[PDB]
Every structure is written in C-alpha cells, then in structure tokens.
Design a binder for this molecule. Structure first.
Ligand SMILES: CCCCCCCCCCCCCCCCCC(=O)OC[C@H](COP(=O)([O-])OCC(O)COP(=O)([O-])OC[C@@H](COC(=O)CCCCCCCCCCCCCCCCC)OC(=O)CCCCCCCCCCCCCCCCC)OC(=O)CCCCCCCCCCCCCCCCC
Ligand SMILES: COC1=C(OC)C(=O)C(C/C=C(/C)CC/C=C(/C)CC/C=C(/C)CC/C=C(\C)CC/C=C(\C)CC/C=C(\C)CC/C=C(/C)CC/C=C(/C)CC/C=C(/C)CCC=C(C)C)=C(C)C1=O
Ligand SMILES: CCCCCCCCCCCCCCCCC[C@@H](O)O[C@H](CO[C@H](O)CCCCCCCCCCCCCCC)COP(=O)(O)OCC[N+](C)(C)C
Ligand SMILES: NC(=O)C1=CN([C@@H]2O[C@H](COP(=O)(O)OP(=O)(O)OC[C@H]3O[C@@H](n4cnc5c(N)ncnc54)[C@H](OP(=O)(O)O)[C@@H]3O)[C@@H](O)[C@H]2O)C=CC1
Ligand code: SF4
Ligand code: SF4
Ligand SMILES: [Zn+2]
Lengths: 97, 63, 342, 144, 96, 115, 208, 54, 176
C-alpha cells in the first residue's frame, strides 16, 4: 500500500499478523483488462469420417423403466438396497480442530 | 367403511371458480386437426379441451 | 364516434371507457374521488396541477399505465387552459377555495376561472362540461362565496350553453372539511353556536354519492343542459347534527349560544392567518345558514344514485377523533339524531 | 515519515492550480487527488489515471461544468460519459479512445445525451403499428 | 428523411402517425415524440451495386462471423439485380 | 356400493349437524370480528353476509362435498379468530369497489359481446 | 457411445431390483407395482390404504432404513379417474440409497397423514392441501400455508388459470387494498411448440 | 458443452456457415429439445443443505 | 474423511488454570478483538468515489438493450422472431410486414424493461447480431411508462451506443 511505516508497525502489532504480506485490496497483480484472442478447441464429435449420429445419440438409448412384479401379471437370503456404508476415517491431515 | 353415495359427481363448489366462468363458459372437446403445412401426424393423437374465445382489445399504450 | 374512443373491455382497470376527462382541481377533496372513479373504468384522465408535484402523488395509483397525465397550468393564463383541454371530450370543473386568498379572491376563483374554462372548452370543441356550484348559490346571499358561485354559474351557462351544472350541499367525507370542522371545535372547550343552532337546517351529502353522480352525468346522453341538486336523504337541525357528531366521536358536548357580532368578530380575527385559516367570516355565514330546498330540480335519484344516509358513513370519518378508550366502539350504538323531515 | 506526509498534502494543494482550484475540486468531487491526464472529452470531461492506487481508484473523471444545455457545476451524474470513455472508465479495456479510437459510422450520434428523465425531452412510449381495421365512409350524396 | 404530418407531428420509418382527431396525441404535450432519423430504406438505397464476374456470388454481410449467415445469390437474370435477403446489398453481372 | 369412503360424516344428517355447528360458531364470532377489526359495518350486516355465504352453496347434496365445505369454513373461521386475516381480507366478502354488473339481456347487449 | 452418452451402471440396477422384489414380497397387501428406471431409481406403486404401513416398514425395518424423508409432493393428471398422485421420496443414510413411493387420490377421498411416521411431512402435507386440495385425514394442524388469506381455489391444478381469477390494487376511496377480477393489459401469449414428428420411438404407444 | 447439437446450441461461427447448424440453432431457440418421458429426483449438496428437484 | 470442530478439552495444570483465571478476570480475548478492530481502523478503506469512479466490468456485461445496424446503415433485424420466442419473461413483442422495397423488416419491436430479466437469451438467439444488451446500466426513469421501449427508442439506443457495443462484441465474439 502507501501507508507510513510506523502506521504499518502499529497495524501489525494491533492485528498480530503481517498485513503487508497479505492485502485485501488489489493493487497490481491482477490480470490485464485486455487479453489476446483465444482459439477454443472443437470437441470429440467434430470428425468427418466415423461420425454417424446414430452411434452417439444419448436421447435415443433411453428406454421405459423395467417393470418388476406387476400385480396384474429355498434359501431366499434377505437383501438390502445397497451394501452398508463404510465408517469414515479421521482426517490424517487435521483430525481435531 | 363405505357410505354408498348415490349422487352425480359435482365439485363446482370446491374449485373456487366464479359462477360467471362456470354457468357461461362452453368448452370444446376435440382432437386437433393436422397442420396442413406439415405431414407429421404426431399432434393428432390426444384429445384436447378448450374454452370459447372472448373479447380482446387494443390497450391504449403500446397497442 | 372516433374509433379510438369506442368502449372496450369489462369496464375494469385495463378497459377503455371512451372518456377523456380534464378534471380541473383534481388535487382536492372531491377531485381525488372523481379521478378514482374515472380511473376505475379505464378512462383517460388529464390532471392539470398548479401545486408541488409531490402533492399529486396520491393520484398516480388511480389509473393504469399512461391513463393519467399530469400537466402544469395557470388559472390566469388562457393558453395553459387551451393546452390542457385540447384533446378532451369532457371537462370537469372542481376549482374552488373556501377561504379568500391574497392572489385569488372569490371572484377570481368562482367567476373568472370557470368562465375562462368554459369559453376555452367551447372554442376547443369539447362535447361535455360539468360545472360544480353550491346548492345555496344566491345573488342576494350574504356570503361572497355563494354570490360568486351564482355569478360564475350564470357566466358558465352563458359561455357553454350545454353545460351540466351540479349543486351539492355540504359534502361530508374522510377529508371533508364539514364533518371535521365540527369535530375540531372540541379543543376550544365549548362549541359556539349562533342561536344554539336551533334555526338552521342542514342536508349534507356523501362524497361517494357526489362522485358517482358526476360519473353518471358524464355517461347520461340527456343531461346536457340540466341542473342538478345533490342533497342528502335526511335534514337535520344544526344543534342535533353537532350533538350527533360529538356523540359519535365520544366527546363531551358543551354548546353555548354566541351572538352574531361576536362570532363574526371571532371569525375575522382567525382570518388573519397567512396559512389556510381555521375559520373565516364567510365560513361563519355559510355554516349558520339553512340549506335551500329546490323540488323543481333533479337529484341523485334521477341519476340512479340512492343517497347514503349520514348514519351509515359517519363513523368512518369521526372514529379518528375518538380517544383510545372509545376507539373500538361499534357503529350502531349511537342512537341516530332526530331528523326534521318535512 | 510525517513531514513527508504533510509535503505530499501541500503538493496536492499546489498541483490543482492554487488554493482556488484545490477548493473547487474538494467541493465538487470530494477528492483532491492528482494523476496523469489521459485525455480530455468533447464535452469538457477530463480523465485521469494513477496506477499506484488499488483497482477501482486508479481511474476517475472530472465532469464538465456545462453539458449540452444544463449547468452542471453541482448536479453531475454518471450518464454523461460518452460510450468510448464509458468503456475505458469502467475497466472494460486497457486503452483509451485517444490511443484506440472507435470505428466511425455515419449513423452514430455525434452528440451524446445524458439521462433525460424528468425533463420535457423524456421518452414517451407509443404504438408504431398502423390501423388494423378501416371503416366504411358513407357517401355524401343524398339518396332521395 | 423524416416527413411531417399536417398536425406538425413527425412521421416514423414505419409510417404511423396520429389522426388529427386522435386523443392519444395528448401524451406528447409538454414532452416529445421519439423518432429515429436514420431511415434504413434510404440508407440502404444509397449504397452502390457491386459488379462481379460470376453467375453466383455469396454474401455474409461483411465481417465473417460478425455478419449474417452466408447465402448465395443467382445473377442470371439480366434486367434485375440480385438482392441479399439479410443485408440488402445488391449485385449485378457486368453488361453493356 | 361405489366403493366410496367418507371424510367425517357417514350420512347427510351428520353433515347437516356439522354445518349447524359451524353456523353457530360464525354467528358467535361476528361481533368480535366487528370490534377487533374496527369494521364500519353493523353486526346485522356481518351476520346476514354469513347467512348469504352459507346459502350460496345450499344446493349441495353430497355428504363428502359438504364435509369439505365445512372444513374450509372452519379454516376461514380459525383465520378470523386468530386475527391472521386483515381488514382487507374481511371486506373482500362485500365487493365494495366493484360496479354492479347487469343481469338482463338488453344491458349486456349494450355493453359488450360477453353474454 | 463413450464421450457424450451417460454411462449406465449395472450393479446398482440389480441391487435396486432385488430390494424392490424384497419389499414386494414382504408387503403383498399394499404394493401394486415395482419399477427401476434405467438411471437407477427405484419406484414402488402402492394402494392408498397402505401409506402408513409401507412408510413405517421402510423407516423401521433393519434391512432397509429410511429415517430421512427427502420430499413429499403431488402430481396432477386430469385424464385419470384418480386425479392426484402422491409421491414420497425417502433417503437411507445407513445403506446410501433412495426409494420412491407413489399412490393415488381424487378430489374427495382423504389420505392418512404421515406426521406420526415423519415430522417433516407436517408442512409438506399442508402445502399439498393448499396447492392441490388433497385432504389429509389426521393432520394435527391442516390449513393454507403458501397462498393468501381467504384465497379461493388451488393454484397447482391443471384446470386453474395461470394468472388466477382475482388481482389486487389499492383504492383510495375505501383506503385499503381490494381484490378485483383480473384484467391483464397484455394477455399471456400461448405458444404451440410441439413437433408433429415423433422424437423417441421407444415410448410409442399402441394405436389400440 | 456436450458436443451434441440436438441438445446444446452450436457455435455462432458454425450457425452462420453450416445449414445443419442453423437448423439446430433455430429449433433449439424456438421449440427447445425434447426430453424422453420419465421422472427423477436429483439432489445435490447445496450450501444450505440438500437441494433437490423432482 | 471427517474432522471434529469442538472436541478438545483444556489442560488442568496450575499454570494453565491460572492463565484461564487471568483471562476471565482481565478480559484478554476482548482486548484481542479490540486490537483487531483498531488494526482495521488504520487501513485504507475499500470505498470508490462514485460517481467519479466506477466499479470494474467486463465485455460480457448485460445492460440496456439496443438494436444495431449494418455498416451500410440497414437494420440487422429481419423479424425472424427468435428473440421473442426464446424470451423467458415474454417481454418482447414483434410485428412485421414487407417493406416498400420488399425487405423483411419489423414494424413494431417493443421490449418491456419491467418484464425483462436481463438474461441475455435474446442476444444469444439472434442469428444476425441485431438485438444486443449494451453496457449501459444507468437508465433509471421517474415513471413506469418510460421503461416500455418501442422500436424507435431501441434504434436510438443502438445509434448512441454502437461505438462501444461493436468494440465489446469484437472483444468477445470468439468465445461464442
Ligand atoms: C496525526 C497527527 C498529525 C499528523 C498526521 O496525521 O500524520 C499521520 C500519517 C498517516 O500516514 P498514512 O495515512 O498511513 O500514510 C498514507 C500517506 O500519508 C498518504 O499520503 P496522501 O497522499 O494521502 O497525503 C495527503 C495529505 C493531504 O491531505 C489533506 O489535506 C486532506 C486531509 C486533511 C485532514 C486534516 O495528507 C495530509 O497532509 C494530512 C496528514 C494528516 C494531518 C494530521 O502518519 C503519521 O503521522 C503517524 C503518526 C503516529 C500515528 C500513531
Ligand atoms: C382538519 O381541519 C382542521 C384542522 O386541521 C388540523 C385544524 O387545525 C383546525 C383548528 C384546530 C387547531 C389545530 C387547534 C389545535 C390546538 C388548540 C388551539 C389548543 C390550544 C388552545 C390553548 C393554547 C390552550 C392553552 C390554555 C389557554 C388558556 C391558552 C380546524 C378547526 C380544522 O377544521
Ligand atoms: C438554528 C441554527 C441554524 C439556523 C439556520 C442555518 C443553519 C446552518 C445552515 C447551513 C447551510 C449549509 C448547506 C448549504 C451547503 C452548500 C453546498 C452546496 O453543494 O449546496 C448546493 C446548493 O446550495 C444551496 O442553495 C444552499 C442552501 C442554503 C441557502 C441559505 C440558507 C440560509 C438559512 C437562513 C435561515 C434563517 C433565514 C432568516 C429567517 C429565519 C447544492 O449542492 P449539491 O449539488 O447537493 O452537492 C453536490 C454533491 N456532489 C459533490 C457529490 C455532486
Ligand atoms: N367541499 C364542499 O363541501 C363543497 C364543495 N363544493 C365545490 O366543489 C368544488 C371542490 O370541492 P373541494 O374539492 O371540497 O374544495 P377543495 O378546496 O378541496 O378543491 C380545491 C381544488 O381547487 C384548486 N384550486 C383552488 N383555488 C385555485 C386557484 N386559484 N387556481 C387553481 N386551482 C385552484 C386546488 O388546487 P391546489 O389545491 O393545488 O391549490 C384544488 O385542486 C369547489 O368548487 C367547491 O366550491 C360545492 C359544495 C360543497
Ligand atoms: S434479456 Fe432475456 S428477458 Fe430480457 S428481453 Fe432478452 S430474452 Fe427477454
Ligand atoms: S432481433 Fe434478431 S432474433 Fe429478434 S426478430 Fe430481429 S433478427 Fe430475429
Ligand atoms: Zn448480405
């Protein structure tokens, strides 16, 4: 910034950190307001040869839902909707805050 | 368990519609005709219900 | 009928009613009701204003988008009147000051301005002209108010032969001066009444009835040259009227007789206020004068309006004057006053 | 460390053209900073920059005291900047019109107008479409 | 290229103007009427006609991706100039 | 048969009994509504308005529809009692700012194309 | 098939089908149909009388625990005899799975309130009653929740008009806000956007 | 965006040179893309909790 | 992977107990908060001197609408009505007819700025860059009627702001 060094020291002592190292205000490290033009690549289906649309039609592969046990129409172990969720681990990075 | 009502179904008192738009309106039940500009027949499958056309005027500002 | 002036719609806010009105003096007590009733039907209202634009803000929500137009004018300038009525097919004149002012005496307000408006409206091709005068408008009257009213009514009839003239009698309403004036008198301890108000009969009329009468007179093809008298259903003695007014407000009534000279002197002293006066000698003369009875003129019943009795729409005006104790009192526990009906 | 601060203050006082200019800029812009003059406007606005300031305070304008028709010594508004200096001032680009002038067209306005709301030049909407139904005009010849 | 109605009111490019008796002119009193003075038809008529030595020419309005979709115009008709559907520019095949 | 199940009432008599209970409750509440909301109408006006709203759908002959109507009426009564409703909500039952639409043929013909 | 098409997951489809059959076998009295959509979502269609038993089983059973109720809404299809369709969306924290329960209703038949089963349902059922008019039998406090006081009609219904029947404005004569019949300055413009050509052949219906 | 012009609009540079691109841009911005019949409940972890749409 | 936020206990040694008692009796953390606030008291405020300074914007910013022209002067709009069909708020109203010279042009083009949501879909749908959302945002009016733009107002906006609209489109048309 442009503050006096004694005021800088007063700020650093009052806050407890070094405010000079980090500043909320932005002075000169941001990008320029004028930039060179981009090129913006095309994509995967921009081929000319092996690009028949019927082989990449996501909307046409959807089908009506599978009907199981229509009402109009031995072991048998009990089954669950999914395997039980596994217990979470305690954050080797910083377990207790 | 079962009351065995013997009355014609009528819910005009629960819908909150003013009687002006119940005793006077005239709905039209039909299958829409095919658009003659096109040959596709996918818009002539289901029955539709619509009301009679009422007055439309030109609003003085913006027309 | 000038196709752009053909009625359309269900008569609501966004409809077209074929009315292009220029309500002179629309920023007053009757003017707000007239503009509200015009804007309800979807009419186009041109409001000529001379006051601060802040004082016309209450009129903006009364019409749809673009249906209310505000223009500045001057009473003594003929070109402004020319500008504001150039495109209207009906002109309503509600200009009037109860108290005489330094720049606009009673002759200026009730004679010169109405005559100029009528002349310019006739010269501009305006089809209808509604003019408001007083029921007690007399040329021999002891009040300059009513003498000016009569002179201006004659001049308007002379300059606009097909003008409809309406003569209400002491309109009462929320902002009405008449109901409030009596309520306001409680502060001075007692209520000074000349001859105890025992020889003065009043026939006040509701404001909504007057506005509806004006609106129905605009839409009545056979009311061109007629003159109407808008009066209430019941006649009251002044003493009983003030007693009922104080009873509705739940205030102690302490009337006492005051001689005419003293009352006039008191009015004169008040008249010296540079602001709007509390009362004037003219108000003294008008408030202690019996309302004329004119059976030869049409009325509200001849326009389809059933006049609203005072006993139904008096609490809505006088509840504001109650204290906290009586603020929640109901309407039908007052035992209405006695009417000297015929 | 302090006398230098007071010297910068006095230099700011001197750099506006004496005490009268300092008071004018203090009472008109509520700020007495000094910066490099990027360019001067067709209507009288002057545009400055100071890259030592943080983003947002490194570009300002001193509005003219007389616009098209109205006195603007006190009542200034942000609608007076013309489009080129509007683009430069709002940090949409790094180049002023003095360096990168806009393309010229025969239809582009040669005189920018501010917000004309509340003045007799305000925009009044209307329908631009012609009549829909034409009516029948009766003949002027009597039929008997 | 603005005209003026008998009532002194400007006429727009569309051509709508209020009838002498139209009450809607009251909205312009003490105010103004918004009219654009750069009429498009006159401005496009002022442009010259391009002479090209091909029976088919293409137009994209100028500017590549900043113009209109590219279209091809046939110039085989001799007594008439090919007109772009989007831009309005005219082209002709050299004669005389 | 018809495999229909009731809401509250088995027959028409219970539905009627509930209608009368609701009518008593509204009749009792009207004066308190007039005092609390500081309305400008008399108690007779409120009570005959309540009667008119009750009679507006007196042609219903289905006990389920009658039960639903009573439920809605109790909802409105509860809103009135707890003061959730304002003066505007109560006065919306009276249509004080609407022009009276004509019902004869000639006036309808004069005004517009809507029957 | 690789870059733009969503990738199908086989394992979850089998798991959801197996659990659907499990629930179907446990509750044959109420469950009418079980479906598994191809984006791996499980649906169970039940009878209106089974709202409490099925939800209680799905919340309390050891194998399938659906303690949390995610959503509860209604869908309106006028062409059906039973107009409304009540949808319950549950979430199992133990097994990291979701299930959906569907039933049907008409204008007059009430449905049992599930407030005892789920605390969350108390507001959701109020909203269903407010917007669709479906009555819930044993609701502790059933009333309008989202609409205006003394608002007639139910807004989320196919028959109901988009702009309603009344509109509000302030009237200076009566000094309060008043409701009057709707009169729009500009009418909503209805667009006909459907294409006259069939898009997805997989959902073609028999022509009878 | 998904490189499927029947769901996402093509680039402005191709809409003005390619016929298929112009047709697809037109039909996407006037009618829109059809969605196969079905019902879903997708929920994300919004900052305020579980935000989902049915 | 999870972490606890309030699952720590304090040491009960006499030094730490005395430190906690001194904190309780002498308001140490309150003084720390005072110090932080005093520290911000001596910084440079982040306030810009509006209206003499404006906040940063981008070429993609959507402001007041405008109708552009070709370099020859012809209007770009061809009454294709795509912008009207895509408008989520139904704020655009368009009418058209053949011109005197046969061109496909509009006779009415209204945008209700009080219905508009400033989403920019209209300038995305337009195939000829006719309707754009210019960079202006300071166009407040004193009446509702002034915000109901017609074709003349939009054309005037285009004529007035073209010098900047063309530059903004040039700086971003490669991203579209
Ligand atoms: C305090 C006692 C007086 C001295 C003083 O205020 O100096 C504070 C000055 C503040 O430094 P800073 O604002 O952090 O530095 C930014 C530059 O001065 C930024 O410099 P600048 O370009 O903003 O300088 C503008 C200049 C001109 O400004 C003005 O004339 C307008 C403001 C007048 C205010 C009175 O400011 C002054 O001359 C007035 C300084 C304070 C006068 C008291 O430094 C000290 O004197 C610290 C003293 C110990 C404080 C504990
Ligand atoms: C709405 O209209 C009206 C008004 O508007 C507000 C009025 O003020 C008004 C006149 C009323 C005045 C505002 C008076 C209000 C205060 C009184 C004058 C009380 C003061 C009287 C004395 C000073 C009492 C003190 C003791 C004495 C001995 C001295 C009237 C009549 C009216 O009608
Ligand atoms: C009881 C003690 C008080 C007695 C009354 C006096 C009290 C003190 C009055 C102090 C007045 C100060 C206000 C005037 C400051 C002028 C500054 C200037 O800007 O005002 C201009 C207008 O000046 C006014 O005309 C001055 C009004 C005061 C006129 C004289 C008042 C005298 C009062 C005397 C009272 C008693 C009279 C005798 C009978 C009682 C308009 O400014 P504006 O455009 O916004 O500012 C632009 C802001 N920018 C920079 C962001 C653009
Ligand atoms: N009120 C009553 O009890 C009765 C009224 N009347 C008549 O009804 C009409 C209005 O009644 P009311 O509205 O209650 O009275 P108001 O004083 O309330 O209406 C006053 C109106 O007249 C305008 N006005 C007054 N003097 C002038 C002037 N010199 N130049 C221009 N405009 C002026 C005012 O404009 P501003 O306020 O901006 O100056 C205001 O709009 C009057 O003619 C009155 O005589 C008839 C019988 C009884
Ligand atoms: S920005 Fe969006 S809402 Fe506004 S006019 Fe364009 S498409 Fe319509
Ligand atoms: S502005 Fe563009 S999208 Fe809208 S009608 Fe004109 S050409 Fe079509
Ligand atoms: Zn071209």
């Amino acid at each position: 910034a442009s503050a006096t060094r004694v005021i800088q020291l007063l700020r650093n002592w009052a806050s407890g950190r070094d405010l000079q190292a980090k500043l909320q205000l932005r002075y000169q490290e941001i990008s320029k307001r004028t930039q060179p033009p981009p090129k913006l690549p095309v994509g995967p289906s921009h081929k000319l040869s092996n690009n028949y649309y019927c082989t990449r039609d996501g909307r046409r592969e959807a089908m009506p839902p599978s009907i199981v046990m229509s009402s109009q129409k031995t072991e048998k172990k009990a089954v669950t909707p999914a395997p039980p969720i596994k217990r979470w681990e305690l954050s080797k990075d910083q377990p207790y805050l | 368990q079962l009351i065995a009502v013997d009355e014609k179904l009528d819910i005009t008192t629960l819908t909150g519609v003013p009687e002006e738009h119940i005793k006077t309106r005239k709905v039209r039940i039909f299958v829409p005709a095919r658009n003659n500009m096109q040959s596709g027949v996918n818009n002539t499958k289901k029955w539709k219900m619509e009301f009679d056309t009422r007055e439309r005027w030109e609003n003085p500002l913006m027309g | 009928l000038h196709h752009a002036l053909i009625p359309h719609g269900k008569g609501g806010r966004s409809s077209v009613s074929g009315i292009v009105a220029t309500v002179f003096g629309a920023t007053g007590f009757l003017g707000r009701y007239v503009v509200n009733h015009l804007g309800r039907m979807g009419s186009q209202v041109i409001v000529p204003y001379r006051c601060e634009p802040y004082d016309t803000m209450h009129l903006r929500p009364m019409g749809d988008l673009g249906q209310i137009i505000f223009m500045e004018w001057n009473g003594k300038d003929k070109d402004s009147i020319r500008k504001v009525v150039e495109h209207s097919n009906v002109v309503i004149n509600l200009v009037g000051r109860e108290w005489e002012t330094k720049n606009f005496d009673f002759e200026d307000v009730f004679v010169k301005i109405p005559h100029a408006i009528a002349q310019v409206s006739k010269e501009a091709g305006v089809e209808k002209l509604i003019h408001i005068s007083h029921l007690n408008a007399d040329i021999k009257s002891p009040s300059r108010y009513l003498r000016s009213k009569a002179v201006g009514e004659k001049e308007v009839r002379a300059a606009f032969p097909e003008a409809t003239i309406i003569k209400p009698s002491d309109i009462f309403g929320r902002e009405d001066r008449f109901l409030n004036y009596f309520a306001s008198m409680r502060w001075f301890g007692g209520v000074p009444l000349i001859s105890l108000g025992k020889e003065t009969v009043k026939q006040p009329v509701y404001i909504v009835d007057v506005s509806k009468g004006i609106i129905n007179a605009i839409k009545d093809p056979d009311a061109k040259g007629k003159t109407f008298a808008f009066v209430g259903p019941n006649r009251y003695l002044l003493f009983d009227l003030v007693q009922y007014i104080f009873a509705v407000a739940y205030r102690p009534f302490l009337p006492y007789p005051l001689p005419h000279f003293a009352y006039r002197w008191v009015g004169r002293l008040f008249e010296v206020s540079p602001f709007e006066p509390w009362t004037t000698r003219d108000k003294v003369e008008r408030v202690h004068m019996s309302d004329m009875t004119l059976p030869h003129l049409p009325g509200l019943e001849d326009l389809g309006i059933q006049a609203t009795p005072l006993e139904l729409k008096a609490i809505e005006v006088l509840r504001r004057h109650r204290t906290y104790r009586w603020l929640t009192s109901e309407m039908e526990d007052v035992k209405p006053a006695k009417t000297v009906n015929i | 460390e302090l006398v230098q601060v007071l010297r910068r203050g006095l230099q700011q006082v001197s750099g506006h053209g004496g005490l009268r200019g300092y008071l004018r800029v203090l009472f008109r812009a509520n700020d007495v900073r000094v910066g490099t003059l990027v360019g001067e406007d067709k209507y009288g606005n002057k545009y400055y920059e100071d890259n030592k300031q943080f983003f947002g305070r490194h570009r300002w304008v001193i509005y003219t005291t007389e616009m098209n028709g109205r006195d603007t010594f006190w009542d200034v508004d942000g609608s007076m900047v013309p489009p080129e200096w509007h683009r430069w001032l709002h940090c949409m680009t790094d180049d002023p019109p003095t360096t990168k002038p806009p393309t010229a067209r025969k239809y582009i306005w040669t005189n920018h107008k501010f917000n004309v709301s509340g003045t007799p030049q305000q925009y009044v909407p209307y329908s631009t479409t012609r009549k829909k139904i034409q009516e029948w005009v009766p003949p002027s010849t009597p039929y008997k | 290229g603005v005209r003026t109605s008998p009532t002194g009111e400007k006429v727009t490019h569309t051509g709508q103007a209020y009838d002498d008796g139209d009450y809607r002119r009251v909205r312009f009193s003490d105010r103004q009427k918004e009219v654009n003075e750069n009429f498009a038809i006159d401005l496009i008529a002022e442009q010259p006609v391009s002479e090209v030595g091909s029976r088919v020419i293409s137009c994209d309005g100028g500017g590549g991706a900043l113009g209109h979709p590219r279209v091809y115009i046939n110039l085989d008709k001799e007594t008439k100039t090919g007109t772009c559907g989007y831009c309005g520019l005219q082209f002709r095949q050299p004669h005389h | 048969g018809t495999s229909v199940k009731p809401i509250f009432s088995r027959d028409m008599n219970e539905a009627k009994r509930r209608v009368r209970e609701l009518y008593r409750a509204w009749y009792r509440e009207v004066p308190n509504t007039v005092h609390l909301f500081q309305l400008d109408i008399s108690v007779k006006q409120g009570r005959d308005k309540v009667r008119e709203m009750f009679m507006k759908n007196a042609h219903v002959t289905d006990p389920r529809v009658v039960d639903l109507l009573v439920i809605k009426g109790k909802m409105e009564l509860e809103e009135t009692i707890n003061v959730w409703k304002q003066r505007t909500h109560i006065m919306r039952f009276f249509h004080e700012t609407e022009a009276p639409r004509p019902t004869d043929f000639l006036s309808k013909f004069y005004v517009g194309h809507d029957p | 098939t690789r870059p733009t098409i969503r990738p199908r997951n086989d394992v979850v489809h089998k798991q959801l089908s197996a659990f659907g059959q499990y629930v179907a076998e446990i509750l044959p009295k109420y469950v009418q149909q079980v479906q598994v959509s191809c984006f791996n979502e499980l649906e169970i269609f039940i009878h209106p009388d089974g709202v409490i038993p099925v939800l209680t089983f799905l919340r309390d059973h050891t194998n399938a625990q659906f303690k949390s109720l995610a959503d509860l809404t209604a869908v309106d299809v006028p062409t059906r005899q039973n107009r409304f369709e009540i949808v319950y969306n549950l979430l199992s924290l133990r097994f990291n799975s979701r299930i959906r329960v569907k039933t049907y209703t008409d204008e007059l038949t009430p449905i049992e309130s599930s407030v005892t089963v789920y605390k969350a349902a108390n507001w959701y059922e109020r909203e269903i009653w407010d917007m669709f008019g479906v009555f819930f039998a044993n609701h502790p406090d059933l009333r309008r929740i989202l609409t205006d006081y003394g608002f007639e009609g139910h807004p989320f219904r196919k028959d109901f008009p988009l702009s309603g029947y009344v509109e509000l404005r302030y009237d200076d004569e009566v000094k309060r806000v008043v409701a009057e019949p709707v009169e729009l300055a500009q009418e909503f413009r209805k667009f006909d956007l459907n294409s006259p050509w069939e898009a997805f052949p997989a959902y073609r219906q028999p022509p009878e | 965006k998904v490189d499927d012009a029947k769901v996402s609009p093509p680039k402005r540079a191709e809409m003005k040179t390619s016929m298929e691109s112009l047709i697809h841009h037109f039909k996407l911005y006037t009618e829109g893309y059809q969605v196969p019949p079905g019902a879903t409940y997708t929920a994300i972890e919004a900052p305020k909790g579980e935000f989902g749409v049915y | 992977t999870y972490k606890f936020v309030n699952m720590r206990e304090p040491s009960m040694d006499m030094k730490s107990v005395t430190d906690r008692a001194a904190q309780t009796l002498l308001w140490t953390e309150l003084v720390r908060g005072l110090g932080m606030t005093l520290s911000y008291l001596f910084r440079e405020p982040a306030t810009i001197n509006y209206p003499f300074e404006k906040g940063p914007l981008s070429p993609r910013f959507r402001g007041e609408h405008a109708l552009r022209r070709y370099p020859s002067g012809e209007e770009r709009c061809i009454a294709c009505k795509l912008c009207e069909a895509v408008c989520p708020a139904q704020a655009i109203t368009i009418e058209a007819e053949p011109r005197a010279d046969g061109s496909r042009r509009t006779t009415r083009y209204d945008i209700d700025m009080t219905k508009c949501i400033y989403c920019g879909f209209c300038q995305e749908a337009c195939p000829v860059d006719a309707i754009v959302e210019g960079p202006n945002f300071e166009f407040s009016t004193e009446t509702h009627e002034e915000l109901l733009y017609n074709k003349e107002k939009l054309l005037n906006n285009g004529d007035k702001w073209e010098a900047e609209i063309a530059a903004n489109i040039q700086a971003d048309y490669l991203y579209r």
